[PDB]
mmCIF file of C-alpha atoms and ligand atoms in Angstrom:
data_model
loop_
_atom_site.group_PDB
_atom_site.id
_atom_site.type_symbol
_atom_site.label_atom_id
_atom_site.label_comp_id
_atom_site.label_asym_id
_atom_site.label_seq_id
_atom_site.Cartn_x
_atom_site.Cartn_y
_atom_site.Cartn_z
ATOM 1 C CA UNK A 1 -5.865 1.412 -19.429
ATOM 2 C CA UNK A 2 -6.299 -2.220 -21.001
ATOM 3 C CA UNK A 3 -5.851 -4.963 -18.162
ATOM 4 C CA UNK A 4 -5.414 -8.382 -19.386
ATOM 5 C CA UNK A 5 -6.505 -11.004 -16.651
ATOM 6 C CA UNK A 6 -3.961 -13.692 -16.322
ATOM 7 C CA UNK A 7 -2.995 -12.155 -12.859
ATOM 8 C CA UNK A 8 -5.470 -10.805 -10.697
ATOM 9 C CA UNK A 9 -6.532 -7.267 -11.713
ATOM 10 C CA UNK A 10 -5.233 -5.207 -9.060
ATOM 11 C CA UNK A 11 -4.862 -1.034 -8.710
ATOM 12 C CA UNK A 12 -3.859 1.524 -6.130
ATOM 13 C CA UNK A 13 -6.854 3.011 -5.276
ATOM 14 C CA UNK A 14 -6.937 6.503 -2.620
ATOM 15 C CA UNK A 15 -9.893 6.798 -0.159
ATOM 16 C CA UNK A 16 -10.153 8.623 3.321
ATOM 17 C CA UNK A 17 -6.712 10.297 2.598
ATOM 18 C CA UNK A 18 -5.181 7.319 2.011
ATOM 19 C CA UNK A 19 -3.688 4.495 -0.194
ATOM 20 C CA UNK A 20 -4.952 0.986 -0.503
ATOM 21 C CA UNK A 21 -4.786 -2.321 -3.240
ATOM 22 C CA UNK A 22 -7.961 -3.065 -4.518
ATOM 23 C CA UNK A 23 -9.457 -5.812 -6.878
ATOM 24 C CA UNK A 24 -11.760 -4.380 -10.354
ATOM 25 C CA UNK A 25 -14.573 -6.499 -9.660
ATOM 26 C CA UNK A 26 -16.936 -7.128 -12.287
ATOM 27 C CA UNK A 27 -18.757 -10.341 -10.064
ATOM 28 C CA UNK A 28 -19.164 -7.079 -7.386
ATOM 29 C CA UNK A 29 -21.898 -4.609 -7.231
ATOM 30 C CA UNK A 30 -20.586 -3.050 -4.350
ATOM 31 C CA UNK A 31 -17.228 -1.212 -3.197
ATOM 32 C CA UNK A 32 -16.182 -3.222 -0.294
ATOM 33 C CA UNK A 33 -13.133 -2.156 1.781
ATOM 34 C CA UNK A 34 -11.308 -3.903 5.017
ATOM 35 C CA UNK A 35 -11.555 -2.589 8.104
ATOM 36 C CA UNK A 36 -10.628 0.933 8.087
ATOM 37 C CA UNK A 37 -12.090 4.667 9.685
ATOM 38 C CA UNK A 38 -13.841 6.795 7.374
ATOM 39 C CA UNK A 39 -15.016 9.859 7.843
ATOM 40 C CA UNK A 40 -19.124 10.958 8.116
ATOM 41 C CA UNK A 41 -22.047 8.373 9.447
ATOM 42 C CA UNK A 42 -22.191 4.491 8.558
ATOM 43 C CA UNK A 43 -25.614 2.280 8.186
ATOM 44 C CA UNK A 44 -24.967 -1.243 8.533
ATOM 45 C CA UNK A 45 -25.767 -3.715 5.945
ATOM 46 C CA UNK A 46 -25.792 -7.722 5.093
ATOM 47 C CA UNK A 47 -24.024 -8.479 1.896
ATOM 48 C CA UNK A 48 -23.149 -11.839 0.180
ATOM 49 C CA UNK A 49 -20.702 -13.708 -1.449
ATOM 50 C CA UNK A 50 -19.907 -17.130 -2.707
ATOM 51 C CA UNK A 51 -19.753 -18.523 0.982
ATOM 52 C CA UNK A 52 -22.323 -16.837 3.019
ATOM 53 C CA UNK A 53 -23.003 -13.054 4.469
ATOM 54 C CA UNK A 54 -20.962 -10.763 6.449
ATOM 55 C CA UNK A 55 -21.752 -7.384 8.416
ATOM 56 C CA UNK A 56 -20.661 -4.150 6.882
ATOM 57 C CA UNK A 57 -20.942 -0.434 7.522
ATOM 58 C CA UNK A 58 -22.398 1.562 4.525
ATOM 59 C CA UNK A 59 -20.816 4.902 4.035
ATOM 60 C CA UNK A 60 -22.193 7.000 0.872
ATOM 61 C CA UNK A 61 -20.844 9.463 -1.104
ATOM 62 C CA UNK A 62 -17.148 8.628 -0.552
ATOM 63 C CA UNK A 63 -14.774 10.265 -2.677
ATOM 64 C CA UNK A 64 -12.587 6.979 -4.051
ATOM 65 C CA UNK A 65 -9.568 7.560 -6.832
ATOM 66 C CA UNK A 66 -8.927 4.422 -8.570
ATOM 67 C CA UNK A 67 -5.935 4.278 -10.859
ATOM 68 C CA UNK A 68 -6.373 8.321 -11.570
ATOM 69 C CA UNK A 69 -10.036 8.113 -12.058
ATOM 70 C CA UNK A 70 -12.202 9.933 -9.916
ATOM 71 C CA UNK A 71 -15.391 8.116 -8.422
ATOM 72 C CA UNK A 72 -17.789 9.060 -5.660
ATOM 73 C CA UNK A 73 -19.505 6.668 -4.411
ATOM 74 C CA UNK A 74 -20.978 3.933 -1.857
ATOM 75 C CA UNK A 75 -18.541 2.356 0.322
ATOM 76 C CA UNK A 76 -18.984 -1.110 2.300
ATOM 77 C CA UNK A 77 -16.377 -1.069 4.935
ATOM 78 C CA UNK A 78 -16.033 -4.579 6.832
ATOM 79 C CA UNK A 79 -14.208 -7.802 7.083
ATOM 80 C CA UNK A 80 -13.762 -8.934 3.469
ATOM 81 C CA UNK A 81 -11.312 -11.147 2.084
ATOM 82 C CA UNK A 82 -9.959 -8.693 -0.501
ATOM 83 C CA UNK A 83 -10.655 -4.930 -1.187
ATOM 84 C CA UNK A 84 -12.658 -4.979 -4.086
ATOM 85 C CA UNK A 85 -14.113 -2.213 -6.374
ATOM 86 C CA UNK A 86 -17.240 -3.093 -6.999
ATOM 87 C CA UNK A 87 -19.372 -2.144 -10.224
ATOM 88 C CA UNK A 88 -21.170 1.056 -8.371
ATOM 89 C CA UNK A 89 -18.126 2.452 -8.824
ATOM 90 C CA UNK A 90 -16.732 0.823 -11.782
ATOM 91 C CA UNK A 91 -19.692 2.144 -13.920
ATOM 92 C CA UNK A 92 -18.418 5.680 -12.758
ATOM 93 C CA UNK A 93 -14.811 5.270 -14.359
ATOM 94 C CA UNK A 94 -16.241 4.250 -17.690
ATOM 95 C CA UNK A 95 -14.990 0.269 -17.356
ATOM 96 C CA UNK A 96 -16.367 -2.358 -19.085
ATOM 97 C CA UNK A 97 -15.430 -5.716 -20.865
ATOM 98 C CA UNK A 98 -14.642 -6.152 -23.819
ATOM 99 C CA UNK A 99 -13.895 -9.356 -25.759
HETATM 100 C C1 2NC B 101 -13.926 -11.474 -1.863
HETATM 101 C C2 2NC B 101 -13.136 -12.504 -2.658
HETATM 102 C C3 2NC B 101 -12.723 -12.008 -4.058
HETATM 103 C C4 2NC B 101 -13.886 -11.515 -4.934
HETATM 104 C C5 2NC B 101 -15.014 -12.535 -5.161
HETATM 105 C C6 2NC B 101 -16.156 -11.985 -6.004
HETATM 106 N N1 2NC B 101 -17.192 -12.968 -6.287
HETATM 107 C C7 2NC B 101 -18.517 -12.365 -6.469
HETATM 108 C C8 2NC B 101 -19.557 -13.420 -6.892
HETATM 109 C C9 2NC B 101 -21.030 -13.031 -6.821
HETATM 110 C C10 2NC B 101 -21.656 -13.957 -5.806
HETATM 111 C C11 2NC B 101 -21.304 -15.317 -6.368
HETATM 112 C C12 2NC B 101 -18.938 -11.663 -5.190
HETATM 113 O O1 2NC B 101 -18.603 -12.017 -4.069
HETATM 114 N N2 2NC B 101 -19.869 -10.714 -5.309
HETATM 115 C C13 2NC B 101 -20.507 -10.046 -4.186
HETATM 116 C C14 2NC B 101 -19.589 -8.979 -3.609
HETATM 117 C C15 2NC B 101 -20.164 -8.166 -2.451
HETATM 118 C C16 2NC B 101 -21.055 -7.002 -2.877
HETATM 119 N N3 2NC B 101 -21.828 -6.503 -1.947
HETATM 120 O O2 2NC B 101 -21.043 -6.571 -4.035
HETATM 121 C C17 2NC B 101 -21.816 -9.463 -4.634
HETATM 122 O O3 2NC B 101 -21.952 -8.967 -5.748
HETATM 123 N N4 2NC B 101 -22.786 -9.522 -3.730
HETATM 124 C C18 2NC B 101 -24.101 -8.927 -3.923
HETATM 125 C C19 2NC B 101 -24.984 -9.845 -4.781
HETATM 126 C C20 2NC B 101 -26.167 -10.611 -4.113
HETATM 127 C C21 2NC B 101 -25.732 -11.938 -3.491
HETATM 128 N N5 2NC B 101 -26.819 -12.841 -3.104
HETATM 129 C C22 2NC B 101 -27.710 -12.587 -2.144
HETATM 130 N N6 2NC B 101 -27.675 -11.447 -1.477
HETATM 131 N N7 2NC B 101 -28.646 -13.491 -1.843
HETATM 132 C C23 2NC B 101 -24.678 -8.633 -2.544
HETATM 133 N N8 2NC B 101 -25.417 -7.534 -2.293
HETATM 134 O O4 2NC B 101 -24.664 -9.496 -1.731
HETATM 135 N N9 2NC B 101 -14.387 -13.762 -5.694
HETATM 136 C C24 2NC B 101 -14.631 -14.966 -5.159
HETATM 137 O O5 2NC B 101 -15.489 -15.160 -4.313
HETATM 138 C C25 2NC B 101 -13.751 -16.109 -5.641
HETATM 139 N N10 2NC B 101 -12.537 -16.113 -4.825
HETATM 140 C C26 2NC B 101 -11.309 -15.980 -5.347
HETATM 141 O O6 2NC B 101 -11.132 -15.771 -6.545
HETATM 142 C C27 2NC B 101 -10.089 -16.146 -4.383
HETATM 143 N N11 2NC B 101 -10.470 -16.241 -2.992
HETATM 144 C C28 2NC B 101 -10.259 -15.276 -2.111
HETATM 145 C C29 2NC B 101 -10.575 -15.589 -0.678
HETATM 146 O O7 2NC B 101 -9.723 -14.226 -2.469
HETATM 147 C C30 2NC B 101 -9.350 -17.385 -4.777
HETATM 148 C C31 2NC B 101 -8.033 -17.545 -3.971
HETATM 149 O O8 2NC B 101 -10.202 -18.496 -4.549
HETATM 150 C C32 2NC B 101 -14.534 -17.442 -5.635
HETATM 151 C C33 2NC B 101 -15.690 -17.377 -6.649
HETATM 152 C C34 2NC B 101 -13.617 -18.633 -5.945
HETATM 153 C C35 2NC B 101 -13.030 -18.638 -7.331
#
């Protein structure tokens, strides 16, 4: 698809068997997803944002459909403020921007 950005750029993505909303993140290099169970072993991790760092578990090699595109890919699961797909797994789907 084309997504236009006057409203935040929100898709159904699938992971762990399940559906969530997610935000195509182009300021993200990482997949990070709320609080959830996934299946297989987690590493944690120290990521950043605009406000600081939070704690995350690192699972790799997660299967992830966004939108009907297949990924596979590293997933940050902890206590973010909004699921966001990150550009690991943007790169995988072919996105870019274009202007
Ligand atoms: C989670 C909230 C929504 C997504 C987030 C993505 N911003 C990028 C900016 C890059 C830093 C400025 C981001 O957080 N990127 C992180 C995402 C986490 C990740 N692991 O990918 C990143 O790439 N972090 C790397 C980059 C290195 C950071 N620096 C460092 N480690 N020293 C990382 N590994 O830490 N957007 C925002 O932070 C913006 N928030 C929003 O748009 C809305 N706020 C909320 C809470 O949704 C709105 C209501 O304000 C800020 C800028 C205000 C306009």
């Amino acid at each position: 698809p084309q997504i236009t950005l006057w409203k935040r750029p929100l898709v159904t993505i699938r992971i762990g068997g399940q559906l969530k909303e997610a935000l195509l993140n182009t300021g993200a290099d990482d997949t990070v997803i709320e609080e959830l169970n996934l299946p297989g072993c987690w590493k944690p991790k120290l990521i950043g944002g605009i406000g600081g760092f939070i704690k995350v578990r690192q699972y790799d090699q997660i299967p992830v459909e966004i939108a009907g595109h297949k990924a596979i890919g590293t997933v940050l699961v902890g206590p973010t403020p909004v699921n966001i797909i990150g550009r690991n797994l943007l790169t995988q789907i072919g996105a870019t921007l274009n202007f």
